[PDB]
Curated annotation (Swiss-Prot), chain A:
Source species of the chain: Severe acute respiratory syndrome coronavirus 2
Range within the parent protein: 696 to 1147 of 1273
Functional note: Precursor of the fusion protein processed in the biosynthesis of the S protein and the formation of virus particle. Mediates fusion of the virion and cellular membranes by functioning as a class I viral fusion protein. Contains two viral fusion peptides that are unmasked after cleavage. The S2/S2' cleavage occurs during virus entry at the cell membrane by host TMPRSS2 or during endocytosis by host CSTL.
Impact upon substituting N247K: In strain: Omicron/BA.1, Omicron/BA.2, Omicron/BA.2.12.1, Omicron/BA.2.75, Omicron/BA.4, Omicron/BA.5, Omicron/BQ.1.1, Omicron/XBB.1.5, Omicron/EG.5.1
Effect upon mutating E370K: In strain: Theta/P.3
Disulfide pattern: C43-C65, C48-C54, C310-C321, C360-C404
Consequence of changing T305I: In strain: Gamma/P.1
Cleavage (site feature) positions: R120, S121
Region called Heptad repeat 1, residue ranges: 198-248
Annotated consequence of substituting D101H: In strain: B.1.1.318
Residues bearing attached sugar chains per UniProt: N14, N22, N106, N352, N376, N412
Outcome following mutation: D101Y: In strain: 19B/501Y, Omicron/BA.1, Omicron/BA.2, Omicron/BA.2.12.1, Omicron/BA.2.75, Omicron/BA.4, Omicron/BA.5, Omicron/BQ.1.1, Omicron/XBB.1.5, Omicron/EG.5.1
The name this protein goes by in its record: Spike protein S2
Coiled-coil regions, chain positions: 227-271
Amino acid sequence: TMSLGVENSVAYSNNSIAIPTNFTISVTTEILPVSMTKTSVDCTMYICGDSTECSNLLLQYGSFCTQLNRALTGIAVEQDKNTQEVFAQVKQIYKTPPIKDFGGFNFSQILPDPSKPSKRSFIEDLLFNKVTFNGLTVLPPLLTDEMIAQYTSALLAGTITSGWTFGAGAALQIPFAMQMAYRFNGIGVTQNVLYENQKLIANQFNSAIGKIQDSLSSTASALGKLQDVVNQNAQALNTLVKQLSSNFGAISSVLNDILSRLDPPEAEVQIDRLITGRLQSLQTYVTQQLIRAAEIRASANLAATKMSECVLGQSKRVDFCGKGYHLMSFPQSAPHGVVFLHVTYVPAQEKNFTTAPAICHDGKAHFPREGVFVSNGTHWFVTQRNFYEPQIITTDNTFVSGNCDVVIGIVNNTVYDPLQPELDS
Amino acid sequence: ALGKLQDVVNQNAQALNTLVKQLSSNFGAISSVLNDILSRLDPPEAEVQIDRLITGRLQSLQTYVTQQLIRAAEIRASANLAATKMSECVLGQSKRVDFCGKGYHLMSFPQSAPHGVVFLHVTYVPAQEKNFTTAPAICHDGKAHFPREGVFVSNGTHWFVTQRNFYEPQIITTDNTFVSGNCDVVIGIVNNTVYDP
Amino acid sequence: GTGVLTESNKKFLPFQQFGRDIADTTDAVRDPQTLEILDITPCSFGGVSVITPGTNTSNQVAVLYQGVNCTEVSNVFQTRAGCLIGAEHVNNSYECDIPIGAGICASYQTSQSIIAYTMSLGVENSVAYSNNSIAIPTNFTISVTTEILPVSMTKTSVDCTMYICGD
Ligand SMILES: *[C@@H]1O[C@H](CO)[C@@H](O[C@@H]2O[C@H](CO)[C@@H](O)[C@H](O)[C@H]2NC(C)=O)[C@H](O)[C@H]1NC(C)=O
Ligand SMILES: *[C@@H]1O[C@H](CO)[C@@H](O[C@@H]2O[C@H](CO)[C@@H](O)[C@H](O)[C@H]2NC(C)=O)[C@H](O)[C@H]1NC(C)=O
Ligand SMILES: *[C@@H]1O[C@H](CO)[C@@H](O[C@@H]2O[C@H](CO)[C@@H](O)[C@H](O)[C@H]2NC(C)=O)[C@H](O)[C@H]1NC(C)=O
Ligand SMILES: *[C@@H]1O[C@H](CO)[C@@H](O[C@@H]2O[C@H](CO)[C@@H](O)[C@H](O)[C@H]2NC(C)=O)[C@H](O)[C@H]1NC(C)=O
Ligand SMILES: *[C@@H]1O[C@H](CO)[C@@H](O[C@@H]2O[C@H](CO)[C@@H](O)[C@H](O)[C@H]2NC(C)=O)[C@H](O)[C@H]1NC(C)=O
Ligand SMILES: *[C@@H]1O[C@H](CO)[C@@H](O[C@@H]2O[C@H](CO)[C@@H](O)[C@H](O)[C@H]2NC(C)=O)[C@H](O)[C@H]1NC(C)=O
Ligand SMILES: *[C@@H]1O[C@H](CO)[C@@H](O)[C@H](O)[C@H]1NC(C)=O
Ligand SMILES: *[C@@H]1O[C@H](CO)[C@@H](O)[C@H](O)[C@H]1NC(C)=O
Ligand SMILES: *[C@@H]1O[C@H](CO)[C@@H](O)[C@H](O)[C@H]1NC(C)=O
Ligand SMILES: *[C@@H]1O[C@H](CO)[C@@H](O)[C@H](O)[C@H]1NC(C)=O
Ligand SMILES: *[C@@H]1O[C@H](CO)[C@@H](O)[C@H](O)[C@H]1NC(C)=O
Ligand SMILES: *[C@@H]1O[C@H](CO)[C@@H](O)[C@H](O)[C@H]1NC(C)=O
Ligand SMILES: *[C@@H]1O[C@H](CO)[C@@H](O)[C@H](O)[C@H]1NC(C)=O
């Protein structure tokens, strides 16, 4: 019987609060299919390959072939539409400066490699390494892998040099550590936490990126969702081709043997059976392809939404841009898909404290302007909610509302007045 | 610009036309007109020619209905997106990037269109950016000061604190900033005087 | 059959007279007189696309033979999508106007003719990044943009018996 997880009772009480004293910078990988192979099937060639006797019999079925061709063409066009929507989200082609003074953060393994013919990143090369004549043709995608790599490079450069300003207007430059301070504000952490732990945070980010590289270079089946799409398309085409060996009640499945051995009056009877069977096979293939293409389009719409809301911005949606408090995201092109490296903030080392909703000083109830009241056992401080930074409770930390006869759990403590010593002195 | 709607219309029309044209196919019969078969042949021979038409036309109807199901699923996805956009752009103000247009979403207005909706997304776009020197913090008395809301900027000689999305420089005071620690940690910290009202 | 016969390196056993493919088509044969193995391949085939500006604009068109080399088939240009005939390849790069494939797009431009090119992805823009420089907007614009979303399709009911067996 499977285990649903490790049981864990939360140490809940009416005056106990756990507050993180540290953090970790997580970098998680999310892989989304964006497009699939653009296949085309010449319906007449597949059913009646180079046979006029069979073609004139297939003309009796109306326009069944032309609408199968129309459906496949629509699928092939929407594949390019999917790729364009996901990756053509940057109006200008941004490139990072030759100076990499990004506050100690190292993006060398996600930035392009000029040495290689295709200016892919190291991780993009890992991704592209990890994913592997009967009327059937494959149409090349409109955007080459070099163009998708250029789009991802432009998105990465815009994010790294300007933050989220390039997705709203003109890309406005800002030092990267100040951008990370903006992200820390956006997740509810005061920005002095970023500045005072800048080297630690940068080291954690670099280590997480290195772990991404190691995992990709080690675990072969990392891009299983892309390989699943590739295998599905391969299986569909293999079934379509192998259906050409079915007799469907004819003497032979080879149209040329039937035409060589039989006269037209008897040959037509067998050719009709072959036409019926192969037409059914083509229709089944095209319907399955339409359903699969709808699934791929849904995946690509999700990928474009994630590009916009995680790479071009900082998302407040929970678990939309990775597990944890989203800081930023980096796109990496993958074969027929995209990879998002979600940098998130994970509180790390929490400690128990005694807490109160409010505090009484002079018959007035005080509440934190920002943060929560905590006690280390004897003294009361006001800390920010996602990081333990205790501070003396003053009249700038808090605000008053009414008296102390209403709040449930209110504790007696003194609220320091910064103006009092100045006035007394 | 209205292509997204017209295409849908076209698609529907096309499908129907195809279906109608499938009634002019013999499917192996001597004629694609049923009265011609009935008016010329006896039932024993009429049934043979009618079965082919029945098979072909049933296949055509099944094709039409399956295509309609797939297209209806696509239209359902589009309409769910349109309802989410109505909720989050017309009935609110979205922080989601590029969900209610390109820029910082201010509001949205709906307009009915044939078989569709049009959203007029009003967004805020920064226009005329200037370069400034900037610091992550400021040192006054061995204490590091950080902006409560905004960024420290310098026009070359003097240091102000401005809001981040619009240049409105202001004097750096103890009300614009907050203190946390000393000046031995913050990388890039600069010396300036913090005013005390 | 029909196709192209080429000398093959397949190592037929003495008792084998032909080989078959997955679709059960004869892929190779043994010549009955000079007992050599021949590979049989389909001659050459592929779709034919017509690249046109609006007939309102011009009646001049280019033709793409999809997935065919520029030898089986003015201006002849070998693309990865196939052979393009009637389009003048240009070393400039513009926005994609009519997509051909593999990064190649076609447009009608200036004496006017259809040209093919490698499409541009946008204008290069190196952001003036440094560790103490910040760009801050001093003004703003209010932009109203239109998004069009389909909501419904036409509700159709088909009388099965009247469509198939009308009266
Ligand atoms: C917060 O956690 C980090 C690790 O994520 C701690 O940094 C480690 O500190 C130890 C001892 O000083 C070193 O041996 C490690 O090399 C450090 N790791 C890294 C990645 O720098 C940090 O000390 C923790 N801070 C608190 C207050 O607990
Ligand atoms: C960013 O990280 C890469 C590797 O993760 C660093 O490149 C390494 O540099 C050291 C010494 O400079 C070499 O011994 C390694 O062989 C390099 N590895 C690779 C994969 O190139 C790079 O120096 C880092 N950037 C900065 C600014 O420190
Ligand atoms: C709770 O915090 C207060 C304030 O930090 C602690 O009181 C201080 O303890 C340190 C211990 O070295 C002394 O140096 C300070 O002079 C004390 N200040 C005051 C105002 O008392 C207190 O000990 C802490 N309590 C617990 C249980 O950790
Ligand atoms: C918090 O302080 C207030 C006042 O300092 C306390 O209220 C006193 O309660 C006692 C016991 O009932 C009365 O005899 C006093 O008259 C009250 N003082 C006033 C000014 O009303 C209150 O009890 C304290 N709370 C706790 C939990 O100790
Ligand atoms: C940066 O801004 C400060 C304050 O706005 C400028 O100082 C003022 O410059 C004006 C010039 O018209 C003088 O009239 C004021 O008397 C100056 N005030 C002070 C307190 O110096 C400063 O010139 C600006 N520097 C640059 C390079 O633009
Ligand atoms: C900001 O001011 C402080 C002090 O006013 C400067 O620190 C002094 O630096 C000099 C030269 O390095 C030393 O001789 C002094 O002893 C330092 N004084 C103190 C109190 O630390 C600091 O260098 C200034 N920062 C900048 C960027 O000019
Ligand atoms: C808080 O106290 C409870 C007491 O049962 C303990 O189980 C829990 O681990 C404590 N939390 C922390 C973060 O130490
Ligand atoms: C909190 O829970 C304890 C549990 O014994 C109880 O004694 C106390 O009265 C509670 N506090 C409030 C404000 O109800
Ligand atoms: C900011 O500095 C860069 C440095 O080259 C310059 O290109 C840019 O034009 C400057 N910004 C403005 C608004 O002039
Ligand atoms: C910013 O980069 C320059 C490189 O020209 C360097 O000299 C300077 O020390 C850097 N600033 C900080 C705060 O390290
Ligand atoms: C051809 O297009 C132009 C603009 O693209 C338009 O002004 C003109 O009316 C069009 N011609 C016709 C016959 O509609
Ligand atoms: C077309 O054929 C020639 C020689 O037959 C060959 O050199 C060329 O590479 C072929 N085209 C492509 C695109 O490979
Ligand atoms: C493009 O420039 C190259 C020179 O590098 C030249 O060989 C080639 O002929 C040019 N292309 C055209 C279409 O003129």
